[PDB]
Design a protein around this ligand. Structure first.
Ligand SMILES: CC(C)=CCC/C(C)=C\CC/C(C)=C\CC/C(C)=C\CC/C(C)=C\CC/C(C)=C\CC/C(C)=C\CC/C(C)=C\COP(=O)(O)OP(=O)(O)O
Ligand SMILES: [Mg+2]
Length: 372
C-alpha cells in the first residue's frame, strides 16, 4: 500500500520550495521513521538540512501552521484524513512544495493451523468507490469453527473507547476512528482488545453492500420489533421480512428509534450477516462463486486468498450443512467527558468498556474456537 509525506505551507505563502526553509514542524515523537526518511530524501535531492520543531501530532502541526506559529509543516497523507475531522477545509488552506511517495509492506492473511478462523467485517459509512476513506461503523468479528459448524458473531460498538493500534498510537479513542487510519488499524485494535488472531478481513461500504444484496436477490430475516428507517420511507413489521438492497441498508443503519438503540442496530447487522450467509451458501451461489467475485471485486476489499475461497466454497459444496450462528456484543457505559485522540478539541460520545463484558466476550470467542 501507498502513502506520502509532504512539506506543506499556507496556500498564499511566499515559500515556493524546500531550500527556502530552515526548519519544519513535525510530530517526531510519533511518526519519526517516516519523517526522518523525508528529511533524508530532502537532503539527498536538494542538499538542504532542516531542523525539526516537534509537534505533538499532525493535527497540532496543522494548527501551528494556520495560526502562523510556523512557516512549514510535514504532513503524512494517512493523517490528513484525521486532520479533516476537525478541519474539513484543510486542503484548501495549504499548498505542498515537496512530496515523497512511500510503500508499506502489507501484512499477509494468517492461515489457521486448525479448524477455526476469524474474519473481521468492516462496514464503511459512505457511498461511492471502495477506496473512499471514512469511519468504520460496522465492526463484526466472525469466529468460524468448520469442525463444529459453529459461527459466533461478536459486535463491538463503533463508539467503543479502546486503544487504537498503528496510526492511533495505542491511545484510546472510539473504534470507528480506526477505520480512518485504515483496515490494518481496525484489525490490530480488535486483535489487541480480544487477544485473538484475525485471519482475514472484509471491507465494504454503502454502495458495496447494495450491490451485494442486489446480486443475492435480497435477504430474508425475522424482525423482532416494529420500526421504520430512512425518514419513514421503509416500515418493518414484526415477523419474516424480505429485504431488497435499499430496505436492507435502512434495516442496518437505523438506531434512534430501536428499543435498545445502537445495541439493537448491531443485532440487526448480525441478522443480516446470517441472511447473507444463507444466500452465499446456496448451491447456486456456491457454484457461481466466480461470477460473484467478478461482480463484486471492484467494490469489496478482502485479503482472503483466492485459494482459500476456492477451498471453502468447494468444501461447502461437497459437505452441505448449515452453520449454527450465535451472537454477542461488548457492553459498556456511554460518556461524553472522555478525550478523543483523533479529535482532542471535540466533546464526543464514547462507550467505556465494561471489564466483565470483555471477559465474557473473550471466553466465548475461545470456546467457539476450541469447540466448546
Ligand atoms: C459462501 C462463501 C463465500 C464461503 C463459504 C462460507 C463458509 C464455509 C463459512 C462461513 C464463514 C465465511 C468463510 C464467510 C462468511 C461470509 C462473510 C465473511 C461475510 C458476509 C457478511 C458481509 C460481507 C456483510 C454484511 C455487513 C453488514 C451487516 C453491513 C454492511 C453495511 C455497511 C457498509 C455500513 C453500514 C454502516 C452503518 C451501520 C451506519 C452508517 O450510517 P450513518 O454513518 O449515516 O449513521 P451514524 O454514524 O450517525 O450512526
Ligand atoms: Mg457514521
Amino acid at each position: 500500500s501507498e502513502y506520502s509525506l509532504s512539506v506543506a505551507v499556507l496556500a498564499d505563502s511566499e515559500i515556493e520550495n524546500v531550500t527556502q526553509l530552515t526548519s519544519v514542524t513535525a510530530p517526531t515523537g510519533t511518526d519519526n521513521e517516516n519523517i526522518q526518511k523525508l528529511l533524508a530524501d530532502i537532503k539527498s535531492s536538494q542538499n538542504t538540512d532542516l531542523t525539526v520543531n516537534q509537534s505533538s501530532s499532525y493535527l497540532a502541526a496543522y494548527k501551528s501552521l494556520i495560526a502562523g506559529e510556523t512557516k512549514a509543516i510535514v504532513l503524512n497523507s494517512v493523517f490528513e484524513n484525521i486532520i479533516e475531522l476537525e478541519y474539513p477545509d484543510y486542503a484548501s488552506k495549504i499548498k505542498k512544495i515537496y512530496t515523497k511517495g512511500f510503500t508499506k509492506k502489507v501484512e499477509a492473511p494468517k492461515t489457521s493451523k486448525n479448524q477455526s478462523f476469524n474474519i473481521y467485517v468492516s462496514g464503511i459509512d459512505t457511498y461511492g468507490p471502495i477506496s473512499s476513506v471514512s469511519r468504520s461503523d460496522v465492526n463484526i468479528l466472525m469466529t468460524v469453527n468448520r469442525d463444529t459448524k459453529k459461527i459466533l458473531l461478536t459486535t463491538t460498538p463503533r463508539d467503543a473507547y479502546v486503544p487504537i493500534a498503528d496510526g492511533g498510537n495505542n491511545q484510546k479513542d472510539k473504534l470507528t476512528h480506526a477505520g480512518i487510519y485504515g483496515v490494518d488499524s481496525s484489525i490490530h485494535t480488535l486483535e489487541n482488545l480480544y487477544g485473538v488472531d484475525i485471519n482475514y478481513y472484509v471491507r465494504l461500504n454503502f454502495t458495496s453492500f447494495l450491490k451485494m444484496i442486489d446480486l443475492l436477490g435480497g435477504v430474508d430475516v425475522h424482525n423482532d420489533q416494529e420500526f421504520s428507517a430512512l425518514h419513514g420511507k421503509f416500515h418493518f413489521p414484526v415477523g419474516n421480512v424480505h429485504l431488497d438492497s435499499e430496505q436492507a441498508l435502512g434495516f442496518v443503519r437505523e438506531r434512534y428509534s430501536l428499543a435498545d438503540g445502537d445495541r439493537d442496530r448491531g443485532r440487526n447487522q448480525q441478522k443480516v450477516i446470517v441472511a447473507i450467509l444463507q444466500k452465499l451458501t446456496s448451491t447456486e451461489a456456491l457454484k457461481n462463486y466466480s461470477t460473484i467475485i467478478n461482480s463484486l471485486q471492484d467494490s469489496i476489499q478482502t485479503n482472503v486468498p483466492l485459494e482459500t475461497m476456492i477451498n471453502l466454497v468447494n468444501a461447502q459444496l461437497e459437505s452441505g450443512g448449515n452453520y449454527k450462528v450465535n451472537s454477542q456484543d461488548l457492553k459498556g457505559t456511554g460518556r461524553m467527558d472522555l478525550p478523543s485522540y483523533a479529535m482532542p478539541d471535540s466533546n464526543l460520545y464514547v462507550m467505556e468498556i465494561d471489564d466483565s463484558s470483555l471477559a465474557v466476550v473473550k471466553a466465548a470467542i475461545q470456546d467457539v474456537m476450541e469447540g466448546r
